[PDB]
């Protein structure tokens, strides 16, 4: 219920999401998060096409890196230099031009100071 990942401030975590590939509707994949009591917040999104978009929220720029492995149909989020304000549930979702579309289960992450 309250079960999740626990990271010490300054530590790192990697997430992954399955990304079947580009359809007529969607041209990428990414993550958003929702902290207790707050609205959903964009985190990052990446295009299936190499070189098209790689978007980051201002709050994670320089600390998080999104990457794709199309040969494995996967995308990854490397979350470095984690801080307490990164505590949230992290959700993967298909992207269209960078925006994320959730058409209904996340990964709960607690970062201590």
């Amino acid at each position: 219920a309250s079960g999740g990942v626990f990271v010490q401030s300054g530590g790192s975590l990697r997430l992954s999401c399955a990304a079947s590939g580009a359809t007529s509707t969607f041209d990428g994949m990414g993550w958003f998060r929702q902290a207790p009591g707050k609205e959903r917040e964009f985190v990052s999104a990446i295009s299936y096409e190499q070189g098209s978009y790689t978007y980051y929220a201002d709050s994670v720029k320089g600390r998080f890196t999104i990457s794709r492995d199309n040969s494995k149909n996967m995308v990854y989020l490397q979350m470095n230099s984690l801080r307490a304000e990164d505590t949230a549930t992290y959700y993967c979702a298909p992207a269209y031009e960078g925006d994320l579309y959730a058409f209904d289960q996340g990964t709960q992450v607690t970062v201590s100071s």
């Binding site: 958003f32 964009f42 031009e97 925006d99 994320l100 959730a102 058409f103 209904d104």
Partner: peptide, 10 residues
């Protein structure tokens, strides 16, 4: 029938 959109950065 319904969708949640989380917009990329402005």
């Amino acid at each position: 029938g319904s969708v949640q959109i989380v917009y990329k950065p402005k």
